[PDB]
UniProtKB/Swiss-Prot annotation, chain B:
Homooligomers. Forms double-helical filaments necessary for the formation of replication compartments within the host nucleus. Interacts with the origin-binding protein. Interacts with the helicase primase complex; this interaction stimulates primer synthesis activity of the helicase-primase complex. Interacts with the DNA polymerase. Interacts with the alkaline exonuclease; this interaction increases its nuclease processivity. GO terms for biological process: bidirectional double-stranded viral DNA replication; DNA replication. The keyword DNA-binding applies. InterPro entries: DBP_sf, Viral_ssDBP_head, Viral_ssDNA-bd. GO terms for molecular function: single-stranded DNA binding. Belongs to the herpesviridae major DNA-binding protein family. This is Major DNA-binding protein.
From Swiss-Prot, chain D:
The chain holds residues 492 to 540 of 1128 of the full protein. Belongs to the herpesviridae major DNA-binding protein family. This is Major DNA-binding protein. It is found in: Virion tegument; Host nucleus. The gene is DBP. It comes from Epstein-Barr virus (strain B95-8). Transmembrane segments: none annotated. It comes from the Viruses. Homooligomers. Forms double-helical filaments necessary for the formation of replication compartments within the host nucleus. Interacts with the origin-binding protein. Interacts with the helicase primase complex; this interaction stimulates primer synthesis activity of the helicase-primase complex. Interacts with the DNA polymerase. Interacts with the alkaline exonuclease; this interaction increases its nuclease processivity. Plays several crucial roles in viral infection. Participates in the opening of the viral DNA origin to initiate replication by interacting with the origin-binding protein. May disrupt loops, hairpins and other secondary structures present on ssDNA to reduce and eliminate pausing of viral DNA polymerase at specific sites during elongation. Promotes viral DNA recombination by performing strand-transfer, characterized by the ability to transfer a DNA strand from a linear duplex to a complementary single-stranded DNA circle. Can also catalyze the renaturation of complementary single strands.
Length: 94, 934, 98, 35, 36
DNA sequence: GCAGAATCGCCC
DNA sequence: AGCTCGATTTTT
């Protein structure tokens, strides 16, 4: 395989299993682990390919990666959690 | 009447002279084939940059005077490329890497190919072909040539007449042209040194034009192919066999149980391609609006020369995926290896591919040893694709290889490795490099090859029946909506789609799905969709009423519908790149061979080889086989062409006195004239077909097409609304932390929805029930495997699911075609080392410093959900085809053909192809708003 | 019309052209609305067959031999019918006939 | 000469000869006339 | 092969005088040389 | 690995 | 003096 196929498989494996919590921080940590500093310029066309079946998530991933880039922490999964985790009404339907 | 009859008398070609002080040298270089150290290059023929506005591409060429008082006329179009031969060092190269001319020379010899052999004369001195008084140091010189007399240009048999000069405006530049005439217009003779010859021009044509035509026939003797094409043009030899002696065969053909019949079929297919392809290329062609460079829309916002050059580089990046696909695909037209035998009877002979086969030794038509083969060679390792295979793809031409390398510089790397800067400062700078000596490490061809290494195809020695990949301009009438050519003529399916766009206009939605007013909130989002659903459901009723009152059998017409694409046969319709000349010519020669295979087989079954060699068998049979081909290849389901007679109206015409003009005196005469050829074969289109409906009849296939009905958990997020629920998320749920995917998946499992702080509860309970209701209705009814991105595609999906239900088509998904469309993006130059130029690189820290402030242009492809809107923009296309052949119905015994859309081979082609029966792909780049005005 | 006579006599013109004209006729005369015919290959199953010894029979002596045999011609053109047609309905379109 | 086996020479000729067929329609009428 | 007309007044008295009527001569073979 | 098809034109 | 017709098989 190409390495972009292995990143894509690992993201579809996370998103297909994550339940009872929103997945964007766990997707962003897997990207920052696999690409490091190269996340700082990740384009929407590359992000949509890597997200595969779940390509709808791309805008929220890119908005999240800009907060890591602009807050001046280094590109590692340990620093990404340390920033993100420091930084509702719900009606039921018939 | 016809375009041939209407064309005027004129010369066989022109020499153009452009002033160096004012001519736009950096613009033409972006469209050229220039390498570092060149003495000649090719550029496109274009009105307003290489020829004057109003240039006639069709002419009657005055080519022979049987005596001083009679002229003969040949009807011909121009050749597509212009050859730049005098002061050519003034045009910048397209690619900066050194050493290409020696690399091409070495690689041509190991494959056993013929190099250009110069005439024993010198090249014509400037004072022999320049107009009176012009300084040769002040001008750039180039040839424009007619398609029928280009071998005469190569062979030094044209005469230039400087006294007949004409002054012409080429864009801003005050330019001059001189006419060219065939030496057969001087029956008393002209001295051998009075004829026009340039050795750098003839060598450039040998490499960049004729070598690729020889590769398409599997011939090595390029100079002998040029000689037989010249005699075919001047002495009417189209019905005489001529290429068979030059043929060569591999051990898989020589060892074959049917080898004697295979050698005859392979030879006869090549003879027919050489008879018919030049005739169709020489024919009179329509003049496209894209041929006018000063009306190109892509320049419309540009101010000054830098903006114009940067606009041409963006234009070139939009074409690169077509060029890189023909390098990366295992089944590219550039890697066709020959003919082999099994498949049903008419499919039993077929075209093969493989670079391993192309390296092997060969035998001649008398079964004697011929070429001895090559054992192979770099950084991609043993048995794998090497830089020599890229040189073979480029026809051993440094001009073509330079423009291929320029397109490959737009491609992304895909690692299956040293960091880029430690490769560029490390092994790329070694004095062992046979190209740069380590003195240009960032732009070197070996550095580009190292970067793209894992995308090149495997090297193959097998004989399987696969589709081959073609590139070129599309025709006028494509049928690529969801039901293809269903009810195209008799209301028509085209009119039904026009009616739907009119209803969507009354809702405030345009043809690309843009709104005049975006939805304000939950009520407005529901209201927007319910109006589109009601508008589609109204049009289904009016259509079903029309089919009923006319008793039309629409329920059976759905079963036989096809998607249709037209591949254009006009050479002037192709994009303004010299690589597209070779891709078009080689696609045409390959299609004519593949169409001819069963025609040759049936004639040989009736007239057996009986141990004769193919040149002996063709001597008796070929004249009859030409006439069978003309009757059975055309209008039988792939190729369309129109025969016509060409006539000239006047018995004399106003022409210069060529005997006085040779002595420098200029005045007119009314010379008697007649046509030397009357018949013309005007080519039209090649037609590509794909079947829409699987009928369940072939029991082995059903598991790929079958429609499930059980209630899935993904039904909202893989349903018809998810892309809109994402696009409008910030207006539906102001300042929520939740992703749109998690909000609707939580609803899909827990039945709950968040209500914004001042918003009303029941308004959101309704939004949720709309999404749920339509998603379950779609899960039940849908047979079109698409998640729509815009309201026009959403509407068209709802419409076509209704028609298929009225036809009882409910058990299976339909076939889809998806367009892959180029998107151009600027990225940090860190892994794109060619931005540094011919610069010396001394350390990885200096490479990192020099790239830290720089950006590179790159290209990726995006999948469209709606091919039919791309086909309205008159696209450049690349696609795979197999030509299948079959018997007629109702007791008929004739052979009919279809060109069926196939699949790409090789994992390096595009990441969207990385894993189907029911989805196929085409690459498309639009031309409306780039080179043609809306 | 495509291969003109140019003052040649018909025997001179046929010397070059006739082999091609045979193949045009076979393709354009049959199954085109008047004449129908079926092409077939003829084969013999046994490699030898029971036949009289013709050298002995010429000298008046009668006995059998299993002579080796093969076909001297393989293609056969079986004729079927010639079709005659007559139109039933006048549609009023040709105003001279009404 | 001799005629072939399949001739269509009733008042409407080859009308609906194959797909009920005009031949079958004529066979139905002869059966009613037999009764 | 379109059905046409007979020429010559000696052929048969039934042909002695149209667009809309044509004639064929016919002799049956069932019950003569072939058994019903 | 990865259907089947008698064909042409017409172009709203 | 005397329509127009894209064609084959099927075969009761
Ligand atoms: Zn180098």
């Amino acid at each position: 395989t190409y390495e972009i196929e292995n990143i894509r498989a690992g993201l579809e494996a996370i998103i297909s299993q994550k339940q009872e919590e929103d997945c964007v921080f766990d997707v962003v940590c897997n990207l920052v682990d696999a690409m490091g500093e190269a996340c700082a310029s990740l384009t929407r066309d590359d992000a949509e390919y890597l997200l595969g079946r779940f390509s709808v998530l791309a805008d929220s991933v890119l908005e999240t990666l800009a907060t890591i880039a602009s807050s001046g922490i280094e590109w590692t999964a340990e620093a990404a959690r340390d920033f993100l985790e420091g930084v509702d009404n719900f009606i039921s339907v018939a | 009447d016809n375009l041939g009859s209407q064309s005027q008398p004129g010369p066989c070609g022109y020499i153009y002279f452009y002033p160096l002080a004012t001519y736009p040298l950096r613009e033409v270089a972006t469209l050229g084939t220039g390498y570092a150290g060149h003495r000649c290059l090719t550029v496109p023929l274009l009105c307003g940059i290489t020829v004057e506005p109003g240039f006639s591409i069709n002419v009657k060429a005055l080519h022979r005077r049987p005596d001083p008082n009679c002229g003969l006329l040949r009807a011909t179009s121009y050749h597509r490329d212009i050859y730049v031969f005098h002061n050519a060092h003034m045009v910048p190269p397209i690619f900066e890497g050194p050493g290409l001319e020696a690399l091409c020379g070495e690689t041509r010899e190991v494959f056993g190919y013929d190099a250009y052999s110069a005439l024993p004369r010198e090249s014509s001195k400037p004072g022999d072909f320049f107009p009176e008084g012009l300084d040769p140091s002040a001008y750039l010189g180039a040839v424009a040539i007619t398609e029928a007399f280009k071998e005469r240009l190569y062979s030094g048999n044209l005469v230039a007449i400087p006294s007949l000069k004409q002054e012409v405006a080429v864009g801003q530049s005050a330019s001059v042209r001189v006419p060219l005439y065939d030496k057969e217009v001087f029956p008393e003779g002209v001295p051998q040194l009075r004829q026009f010859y340039n050795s750098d021009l003839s060598r450039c044509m040998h490499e960049a034009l004729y070598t690729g035509l020889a590769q398409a026939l599997r011939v090595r003797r390029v100079g002998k192919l040029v000689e037989l094409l010249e005699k075919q043009s001047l002495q009417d030899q189209a019905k005489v066999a001529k290429v068979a002696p030059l043929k060569e065969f591999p051990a898989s053909t020589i060892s074959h149980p049917d080898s004697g019949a295979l050698m005859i079929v392979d030879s006869a297919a090549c003879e027919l391609a050489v008879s018919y392809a030049p005739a169709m290329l020489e024919a009179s062609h329509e003049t496209p609006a894209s041929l006018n460079y000063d009306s190109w829309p892509l320049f419309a916002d540009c101010e000054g020369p830098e903006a114009r050059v940067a606009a041409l580089h963006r234009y070139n990046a939009s074409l690169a995926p077509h060029v890189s696909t023909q390098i990366f695909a295992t089944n590219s037209v550039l890697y066709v290896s020959g003919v082999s035998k099994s498949e049903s009877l008419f499919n039993s002979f077929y075209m093969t591919h493989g670079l391993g086969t192309l390296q092997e030794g060969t035998w001649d038509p008398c079964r004697r040893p011929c070429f001895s083969g090559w054992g192979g060679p770099g950084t991609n390792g043993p048995g794998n694709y090497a830089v020599e295979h890229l040189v073979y793809a480029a026809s051993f031409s440094p001009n073509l290889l330079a423009r291929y390398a320029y397109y490959l510089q737009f491609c992304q790397g895909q690692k299956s490795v040293p960091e880029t800067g430690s490769y560029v400062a490390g092994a790329a700078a070694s004095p062992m490099c046979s190209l740069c000596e380590g003195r240009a490490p960032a732009v070197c061809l070996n550095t580009l090859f190292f970067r793209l290494r894992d995308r090149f195809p495997p090297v193959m020695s097998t004989q399987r029946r696969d589709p081959y990949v073609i590139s070129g301009a599309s025709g006028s009438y494509n049928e690529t909506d969801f039901l293809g050519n269903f009810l195209n003529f008799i209301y028509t399916y085209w009119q039904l789609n026009q009616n739907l766009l009119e209803r969507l206009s009354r809702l405030g939605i345009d043809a690309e799905g843009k709104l005049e007013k975006e939805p304000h909130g939950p009520r407005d989002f529901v209201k927007m969709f319910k109006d589109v659903d009601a508008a589609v459901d109204a049009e289904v009723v009016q259509f079903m009423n029309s089919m009923a009152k006319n008793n039309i059998t629409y329920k059976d017409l759905v079963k036989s519908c096809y998607h249709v694409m037209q591949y254009s046969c006009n050479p002037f319709a192709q994009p303004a790149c010299p690589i597209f000349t070779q891709l078009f010519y080689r696609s045409l020669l390959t299609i004519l061979q593949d169409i001819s295979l069963p025609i040759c087989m049936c004639y040989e079954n009736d007239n057996p080889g009986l141990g004769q060699s193919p040149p002996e068998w063709l001597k008796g049979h070929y004249q009859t086989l030409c006439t069978n081909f003309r009757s059975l290849a055309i209008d039988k389901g792939v190729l369309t062409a129109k025969e016509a007679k060409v006539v000239h109206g006047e018995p004399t015409c106003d022409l210069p006195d060529l005997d006085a003009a040779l002595q420098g005196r200029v005045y007119g005469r009314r010379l008697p004239v007649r046509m030397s050829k009357v018949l013309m074969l005007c080519p039209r289109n090649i037609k590509i077909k794909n079947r829409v409906v699987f009928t369940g009849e072939n029991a082995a296939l059903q598991n790929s097409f079958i429609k499930s009905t059980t209630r899935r958990e993904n039904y909202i997020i893989n349903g018809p609304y998810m892309k809109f629920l994402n696009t409008y998320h910030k207006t539906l749920f102001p300042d929520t932390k939740l992703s749109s995917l998690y909000l609707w998946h939580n609803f899909s499992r827990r039945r709950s929805v968040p209500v914004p702080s001042g918003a009303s509860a029941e308004e959101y309970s309704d939004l949720a029930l709309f999404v749920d209701g339509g998603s379950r209705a779609h899960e039940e009814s849908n047979v079109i495997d698409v998640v729509p991105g815009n309201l026009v595609t959403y509407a068209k999906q709802r419409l076509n699911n209704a028609i298929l239900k009225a036809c009882g088509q409910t058990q299976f998904y339909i076939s889809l075609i998806q367009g892959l469309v180029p998107r151009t993006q600027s990225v940090p130059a860190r892994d794109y080392p060619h931005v540094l130029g011919t610069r010396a690189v001394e350390s990885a820290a200096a490479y990192a410093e020099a790239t830290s402030s720089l950006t590179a242009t790159t290209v990726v492809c995006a999948a469209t959900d709606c091919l039919s809107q791309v086909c309205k923009a008159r696209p450049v296309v690349t696609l795979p085809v197999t030509i299948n052949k079959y018997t007629g119905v109702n007791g008929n015994n004739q052979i009919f053909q279809a060109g069926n859309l196939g699949y790409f081979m090789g994992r390096g082609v595009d990441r969207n192809l990385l894993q189907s029966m029911r989805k196929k792909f085409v690459f498309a780049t639009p031309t409306l708003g780039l080179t043609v005005k809306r």
